[PDB]
């Protein structure tokens, strides 16, 4: 009702939509009971009661036990049995169950309600040997699971007796032995904990309820919620349920199954069964499970009912189901059902098959494949993760999903060489740097000791869809000795290593792969998602190849080409950029810009060709000037530059010192450059249009857009747009061709949103840069936030990394403000977002709600953004 | 839409409140005509017509001239004369006039409308010599001022004639000679430019109107508007006005006066007069000026009327007036009036006297002293900045206003040594550090190559009122060689140098200072200001002495005590801070904190004592951690730290590297420290309350407030407040005394304003940190904005430095948002501001308008803030 919800024959107080309050288990237990399936009657204590228990100093809140007892009165009346009553005993199980899968909860306990009086009656009704062996096992399990007594003490007593009676197997103990062994188990309670074994079933129950509530706060449970940043959950529910017995004979048993294969998706029952056994009997390890076919032979009637129950449950839930069942002398009892966990390949197969079956429509099917299911299918995967558990030597952050296998190297230069030679390289560094970008691209996998889900390594890796395990604090990298260590284990250069960027696992040796499981059912499924979504999904790509990759993965255009990232390919390009940054005179700047123009024009041609017929938004330079400079001592930087620039050493020292900035993220960057050196903008715009026309002449449909970075005033935008229009006029005149184009702005400075109504009058489109916008809104340095982020997460100051999940109340308020103002000022304004949040499912759902026109994300995140964009609609 | 506004006998179309449209001159001409003063009738062409002329490619827009002629018809009818008519000639002057004083506009031209026919009649009617000398003068002035013909060519003709006719002085020429000479002046037009002298008055007029409009865009006018950051002004007005003749004889003349002494403020007419001369002769400064007594003797009636008119004008304008007047044959004409420019000493004297006289009320009096006047009374100024223009060698950011003159040194230690020896030191560094604070205090001026107007070093400088020029990228400092360079120029140690911290100018040599003026009336005037203002003025002070200086200057309390700035005084304090920053264990931190506690407690006692009876707001640590480390090589820093820390060298290296940050302004600072290391907040809060109780026990009234820095979520504030309350309870229990106190938060992060309604529930007060808030809102690094600020100002992107003048449309919107949300959530919330804008007059007006409770500023700005709070001039 309020905290206690009963369920029984043909009725129930809860339902499947109350997982939050009753947990998954309690919710479906009620659901199965309400649809008329044979479910042993019971009650569920809500998750709110768990929270009240924790908030009340780990003690049951007033009144709760009376509500619990009312529920028990229902269960007793329904079973025509009573707790302490040896003539008509009621036995109970106590089962944990939160809203979602949660490790560290209390294991389920069975046969709660046994004592000497009840067992004596049980002995008379069903045999002494069976009764006292059950009593013995209950003493062991209840003590361990509820009281915290290790099994080793109960086993010590069992072996002691066996030793002193010369008996070699458990099976050789007489009922008299077991009756005395019961007394020994009882003693274990006093010896281990000093409490007695509770002989009143109601005390056993109170202890079990407390233990389940306590389990919610177990160190294992807290760590799971902390790591995965699970925030909603109030607590765990407690399910108290009447017992049914699958260990009464060869017409009895217990089993589990998925209604379809959870690996392949094949529509065929997939499960186990144990004849003459309780649920607990395999966990005890004493029995080996058999296939379902055994049930069909030994219980044809119960098997028949099970099959039809599976059809019922699939029809009712419209999904593949994970069910637990027990048969007590030909009578089938349903004990659990839930949506069945499955692989990505299984999810897509099941969803598509269920559509073909007419069981679900495409709207529902889109909700049957999780984004994480899709992600499995987009990358290489290990053939059998469980097979390599033995070889795992560390676990870091899953920076970029996918499997990688190769040989260890400690240098980006060596990674390129090895890749050129056809070797597979796993690049291992403490941290990665701009100079490492070449090798990182060449490496099969990247492993770093520092850095979070937003490190340089992590984001560049995730851009390329390249496996990356980041922030692996366990490793110590030693360049000088060409090794890295984990404890006393040494891993040398050349050694084979495997990385799982999805789980963060670091594995020794050359593990077996499977390629991405591209297949027809995925294309058909994604086509449903594509027809469903309202948002368009553009791509963040800076190179022709990345643009092509982006289109192959479904991108409908380029929402962001970061021109600052278009000079990593070769030394000549790096040399030219360095000349431009080191320039002091306007002639030195003209020389450097004239060198850069062919590279910009050529790359833009390649991007335009890849995106034939789709819009391409190119952004003006927003460079990290200090990052374009060599790494090393000021003696090496000045010397290397002197070679690349030809300038005197003192001129380089002067310029380096003049370029240094205390806070470069807020410094002389973005449109502040384009405005201060309009020649820079002229060069880039000339490359854009010269390339646009050239490709137009080759039959390529060019739909160019030019975007200004880091705008905080309408005047900045107006200034750069003026330059753009001038250069467009010239090029069009020179080449005898005029192309339509658009000019727009980043909205990544809080001020831009605050006066968006002024900026909207002057822009064809907005694109939210939520990386900088989050940085400026919070005042978090995107390069240093790791210094306090973990504490802030631990202390409940933040729920997620705001650089990963979009901050709705703060940043999101600027996004709504800018969008509203912009569209009011310019009804034809287009609004997108190209920050990292654009690929993050919950943020995509937010962006859809705010009415944006598109999201833009790096190429291998496009499929995810697509499915995410479809799931918020349906 | 009207562009021509006439004025004449007892009527006028404009008025004094239309300066924006008619200019000051045209407005007051109309105003004087309207109050019935004898003003020569005329018309004013609006500043809009100037803008239209500039927007129509420097040509008169279509209907304007016909509108000008209609105005001329009015003038002609009013004077009963006509242009070109020798029987009843109308002669005109053309006078420029913008809304405010503006150099670079066209000089006034007189006697427009003369030719041979008109002059022949003028001769007959009013004397040949007067006519032809007027003609000759007009030919010269019109040719030079309107046609661009140098005076030297006209003078060459005059001298030639004198040479041939054997006469020595101009005045010795007969009317016949002048008649011959005008023909020569006519020839000058042809010889000089190939132009003819326009004989038609309407053409003369057309050219004069064009020239005035063109003069608005003169290089000198552009530069003045640019350097003074004058934005708004559409153009200049043109005044076409009937002539009166002060050169008809010895019963005629021209004069200027102030209605009171502009230097002393004495209520006595202060001016000059020239018998038999035109206003041109007053500009030229060739004739020796005669005293007003000369006018009284020679034109008694005109003098009597002038004295009457001066009282009229003072009553009408309620201020001291600067008037120009002409006497034509005993008849007085008023030709200009405006509020008279005056010194700071004069402004105060005039304001107080006018109150005593019953002419104005205290309300108006507080408007009669500009903040710049008060600044002239309180601080040194250079006597005439334009005179040293030739010696300026660089211009940096005006970090702290004021004039400094001293000898160059490159070391804070030498600066204090020199100050002890009685020398004046200009401290020149690349950057300043904590260890330099002593020398900075001892130096007359500070010049840095890096840093902005709001870099904490500059902030500390402005605290002392010490002239500081920052961000002077032109200079290269060389400590070893004991010089610094600007281009090829070398400036040695010991050389004399002058700094203008208001303009950022760096001047070679010893420049002259304006003598500070003592004012006996300043106390009563400031008292009126104090009664008038609504805002309270608190002080930003971090030491007991600074607190006392703030109180002496009128501070009503401490709005911000920056605890990070409370460890500069000695080496022992710096070491203690270094022990705390280098701490890795909680024990090392507890040690360091125990060492810091006595300094904090001692300082807080001194501050509480100085501010006896007034509120003192102490802010928790917000430190630049990198800045607290020794200067020098990483070999020296590690050794110095190793000695006093007693940590291993490798532990120091690792900690130094772990503390380094890419963007420290957005890094591990503010409440991010207090939350990560609550022991730090415990220590500070314990010092605060222990000091508060101690001083209370000595009879001091302590009104303590504790403020949390850099909050962006309600959780951050809640966290630190929880710590504060815990410590408060302990200390009050320990010492047996309970004090009332308040807890609050900085609003200096855009997110804090965006969710202020949540933060307001948990704060007793907000204080806007508009330094950081501007930094985060614009994305401008407070230390590096100087690299593009000048370009942005020059290109019209910014109107002001947003770190100096509050950005109302952006940052101001967050201020209003936060204030509104906070007060809705907590009706008793107090809201202040302690950013640098708190001392800036226009920003103080804005803060008044948004309904803040107080402004807080550094001690020497308190007086300007007080007056600014009284004036509230947007
Ligand atoms: N009242 C009962 N009568 C008979 N058999 C029972 C009864 N309650 C339970 N069981 C069995 O006990 C075993 C464990 O129960 P759970 O429901 O806890 O499932 P678990 O795998 O332990 N964790 P989870 O599924 O993730 O929630 C199952 O096989 C069920 Br059929
Ligand atoms: N119609 C007239 N009859 C006679 N004399 C006249 C007439 N119009 C003007 N003058 C005089 O000409 C001189 C210059 O005129 P301005 O208005 O230009 O004053 P300036 O100082 O040069 N610029 P300012 O700073 O705005 O005041 C003044 O001395 C006036 Br009285
Ligand atoms: Mg189960
Ligand atoms: Mg950006
Ligand atoms: Mg004048
Ligand atoms: Mg601050």
Numbering used by the authors:
A (entry chain A), B (entry chain D): 1 to 874
Text taken from the publication that reported this structure:
Here, the rate limiting regeneration of the primary CO2 acceptor phosphoenolpyruvate (PEP) is catalyzed by the multi-domain protein pyruvate phosphate dikinase (PPDK). Previous studies emphasize that PPDK has a modular structure consisting of distinct substrate binding domains for PEP/pyruvate at the C-terminus (PBD) and for nucleotides ATP/AMP at the N-terminus (NBD, aa 1–340). A central domain (CD, aa 380–515) catalyzing the phosphoryl group transfer from ATP to pyruvate–or from PEP to AMP–via a phospho-histidine intermediate mediates a catalytic cross-talk between the distant substrate binding domains. Distinct conformational states resolved in crystal structures from maize and the non-plant organisms Clostridium symbiosum and Trypanosoma brucei suggest that the phosphoryl group transfer in the catalytic cycle is accompanied by a large swiveling motion of the CD from a position next to the NBD to a position facing the PBD (~110° and 45 Å).
Here, we co-crystallized the C4-PPDK from Flaveria trinervia and the related C3-PPDK from Flaveria pringlei with their natural product PEP and the substrate analogue 2′-Bromo-2′-deoxy-adenosine-5′-[(β, γ)-imido]triphosphate (2′-Br-dAppNHp). Electron density maps clearly indicate main chain connectivity and most of the side chain orientations for subunits A, C and D, whereas the majority of the NBD in chain B is not traceable. The overall structures of both FtPPDK crystal forms are highly similar to PPDKs from C. symbiosum, T. brucei and Z. mays consisting of an N-terminal NBD (aa 1–340), a CD (aa 380–515) of β-strands with associated α-helices that contain the catalytic H456 in helix 20 involved in the phosphoryl group transfer between NBD and PBD, and a C-terminal TIM barrel containing the PBD (aa 535–874). Therefore, the structural conformations resolved in the 2'-Br-dAppNHp-FtPPDK structure visualize and verify for the first time the proposed phosphoryl group transfer mechanism in the PBD and the involvement of the catalytic histidine in the CD in this process.
